[PDB]
């Protein structure tokens, strides 16, 4: 509360460390469904159904331009990419499986880097 603060967690490396995670997600062999925004002209149903599209290239641009206020807003966008994927793709599809695999990969890196 006023003039009463928990000890200051060092967040000075968060930007660099989120960048490194995002690099590792970008280079994973199963990243291909997530590298670029879904083409809303060419994928029937996506625009109406998926209210907040997100992809790795959009996260990279947001990260690089100071549009993440903190490491949690960064994780929220990464998770959004996988939540969108689960919303639109059957679990038993190449893209559906890709999304599960990447979410697992992310969550481990996240825990190991920050928890």
mmCIF file of C-alpha atoms in Angstrom:
data_model
loop_
_atom_site.group_PDB
_atom_site.id
_atom_site.type_symbol
_atom_site.label_atom_id
_atom_site.label_comp_id
_atom_site.label_asym_id
_atom_site.label_seq_id
_atom_site.Cartn_x
_atom_site.Cartn_y
_atom_site.Cartn_z
ATOM 1 C CA UNK A 1 0.000 0.000 0.000
ATOM 2 C CA UNK A 2 1.237 3.643 0.249
ATOM 3 C CA UNK A 3 4.940 3.684 1.311
ATOM 4 C CA UNK A 4 4.755 -0.170 1.876
ATOM 5 C CA UNK A 5 6.375 -2.287 -0.796
ATOM 6 C CA UNK A 6 7.480 -5.893 -1.218
ATOM 7 C CA UNK A 7 11.187 -6.219 -2.091
ATOM 8 C CA UNK A 8 12.080 -5.116 -5.727
ATOM 9 C CA UNK A 9 12.285 -8.213 -8.089
ATOM 10 C CA UNK A 10 14.935 -7.427 -10.753
ATOM 11 C CA UNK A 11 13.048 -7.064 -14.071
ATOM 12 C CA UNK A 12 15.960 -5.393 -15.987
ATOM 13 C CA UNK A 13 16.680 -8.566 -18.034
ATOM 14 C CA UNK A 14 13.024 -9.465 -18.793
ATOM 15 C CA UNK A 15 13.052 -7.848 -22.297
ATOM 16 C CA UNK A 16 16.142 -9.777 -23.349
ATOM 17 C CA UNK A 17 14.966 -12.988 -21.859
ATOM 18 C CA UNK A 18 11.427 -12.764 -23.507
ATOM 19 C CA UNK A 19 13.310 -12.111 -26.830
ATOM 20 C CA UNK A 20 15.307 -15.290 -26.357
ATOM 21 C CA UNK A 21 12.271 -17.362 -25.618
ATOM 22 C CA UNK A 22 10.490 -15.930 -28.663
ATOM 23 C CA UNK A 23 13.611 -16.797 -30.783
ATOM 24 C CA UNK A 24 13.405 -20.391 -29.604
ATOM 25 C CA UNK A 25 9.656 -20.529 -30.401
ATOM 26 C CA UNK A 26 10.362 -18.998 -33.903
ATOM 27 C CA UNK A 27 12.963 -21.700 -34.719
ATOM 28 C CA UNK A 28 10.991 -24.734 -33.465
ATOM 29 C CA UNK A 29 10.115 -27.038 -36.338
ATOM 30 C CA UNK A 30 6.392 -26.902 -35.422
ATOM 31 C CA UNK A 31 6.236 -23.072 -35.421
ATOM 32 C CA UNK A 32 5.089 -22.881 -39.106
ATOM 33 C CA UNK A 33 1.316 -22.360 -38.361
ATOM 34 C CA UNK A 34 2.191 -19.424 -36.035
ATOM 35 C CA UNK A 35 5.002 -17.485 -37.849
ATOM 36 C CA UNK A 36 2.737 -15.022 -39.668
ATOM 37 C CA UNK A 37 -0.737 -13.660 -39.226
ATOM 38 C CA UNK A 38 -3.561 -15.919 -40.496
ATOM 39 C CA UNK A 39 -4.659 -14.478 -43.907
ATOM 40 C CA UNK A 40 -8.162 -13.173 -43.111
ATOM 41 C CA UNK A 41 -9.068 -12.825 -46.802
ATOM 42 C CA UNK A 42 -8.165 -16.453 -47.558
ATOM 43 C CA UNK A 43 -9.347 -18.359 -44.461
ATOM 44 C CA UNK A 44 -13.097 -18.469 -44.263
ATOM 45 C CA UNK A 45 -14.471 -18.034 -40.784
ATOM 46 C CA UNK A 46 -11.285 -16.794 -39.068
ATOM 47 C CA UNK A 47 -12.090 -13.106 -39.004
ATOM 48 C CA UNK A 48 -15.537 -13.566 -37.427
ATOM 49 C CA UNK A 49 -14.633 -16.321 -35.031
ATOM 50 C CA UNK A 50 -11.186 -15.276 -33.689
ATOM 51 C CA UNK A 51 -11.731 -11.959 -32.082
ATOM 52 C CA UNK A 52 -8.059 -11.254 -31.296
ATOM 53 C CA UNK A 53 -5.681 -12.823 -33.876
ATOM 54 C CA UNK A 54 -2.072 -13.167 -32.709
ATOM 55 C CA UNK A 55 1.074 -14.691 -34.219
ATOM 56 C CA UNK A 56 4.852 -14.788 -33.521
ATOM 57 C CA UNK A 57 5.732 -12.016 -36.029
ATOM 58 C CA UNK A 58 3.191 -9.651 -34.390
ATOM 59 C CA UNK A 59 4.570 -10.506 -30.931
ATOM 60 C CA UNK A 60 8.091 -9.866 -32.246
ATOM 61 C CA UNK A 61 7.114 -6.418 -33.551
ATOM 62 C CA UNK A 62 5.263 -5.524 -30.297
ATOM 63 C CA UNK A 63 8.304 -6.679 -28.237
ATOM 64 C CA UNK A 64 10.817 -4.771 -30.373
ATOM 65 C CA UNK A 65 8.813 -1.503 -30.129
ATOM 66 C CA UNK A 66 8.023 -1.363 -26.395
ATOM 67 C CA UNK A 67 4.449 -2.358 -26.618
ATOM 68 C CA UNK A 68 4.705 -4.919 -23.738
ATOM 69 C CA UNK A 69 4.524 -3.147 -20.368
ATOM 70 C CA UNK A 70 5.718 -6.197 -18.497
ATOM 71 C CA UNK A 71 6.629 -9.910 -18.920
ATOM 72 C CA UNK A 72 3.031 -11.025 -18.128
ATOM 73 C CA UNK A 73 1.483 -9.085 -21.011
ATOM 74 C CA UNK A 74 4.064 -10.872 -23.237
ATOM 75 C CA UNK A 75 2.992 -14.359 -21.927
ATOM 76 C CA UNK A 76 -0.662 -13.432 -22.475
ATOM 77 C CA UNK A 77 -0.043 -12.839 -26.219
ATOM 78 C CA UNK A 78 1.983 -16.051 -26.587
ATOM 79 C CA UNK A 79 -0.880 -18.001 -24.864
ATOM 80 C CA UNK A 80 -3.396 -16.193 -27.119
ATOM 81 C CA UNK A 81 -1.661 -17.689 -30.155
ATOM 82 C CA UNK A 82 -2.341 -21.207 -28.746
ATOM 83 C CA UNK A 83 -5.835 -20.492 -27.507
ATOM 84 C CA UNK A 84 -6.744 -19.217 -30.945
ATOM 85 C CA UNK A 85 -5.239 -22.321 -32.499
ATOM 86 C CA UNK A 86 -7.311 -24.592 -30.196
ATOM 87 C CA UNK A 87 -10.437 -22.576 -30.974
ATOM 88 C CA UNK A 88 -10.100 -23.076 -34.775
ATOM 89 C CA UNK A 89 -8.321 -26.407 -35.296
ATOM 90 C CA UNK A 90 -9.251 -29.956 -34.387
ATOM 91 C CA UNK A 91 -6.850 -31.595 -31.843
ATOM 92 C CA UNK A 92 -6.351 -34.438 -34.379
ATOM 93 C CA UNK A 93 -4.824 -32.224 -37.141
ATOM 94 C CA UNK A 94 -1.267 -31.272 -37.940
ATOM 95 C CA UNK A 95 -1.943 -27.663 -36.832
ATOM 96 C CA UNK A 96 -3.910 -28.763 -33.738
ATOM 97 C CA UNK A 97 -0.991 -30.972 -32.612
ATOM 98 C CA UNK A 98 1.498 -28.229 -33.460
ATOM 99 C CA UNK A 99 -0.336 -25.859 -31.102
ATOM 100 C CA UNK A 100 -0.297 -28.293 -28.231
ATOM 101 C CA UNK A 101 3.386 -29.037 -28.753
ATOM 102 C CA UNK A 102 4.324 -25.332 -28.877
ATOM 103 C CA UNK A 103 2.295 -24.444 -25.804
ATOM 104 C CA UNK A 104 4.136 -27.144 -23.843
ATOM 105 C CA UNK A 105 7.487 -25.968 -25.163
ATOM 106 C CA UNK A 106 6.639 -22.380 -24.187
ATOM 107 C CA UNK A 107 5.358 -23.126 -20.700
ATOM 108 C CA UNK A 108 8.515 -25.043 -19.788
ATOM 109 C CA UNK A 109 10.787 -22.278 -20.993
ATOM 110 C CA UNK A 110 8.640 -19.774 -19.138
ATOM 111 C CA UNK A 111 8.812 -21.672 -15.795
ATOM 112 C CA UNK A 112 12.557 -22.388 -16.153
ATOM 113 C CA UNK A 113 13.430 -18.806 -17.051
ATOM 114 C CA UNK A 114 11.187 -16.916 -14.547
ATOM 115 C CA UNK A 115 9.748 -19.266 -11.765
#
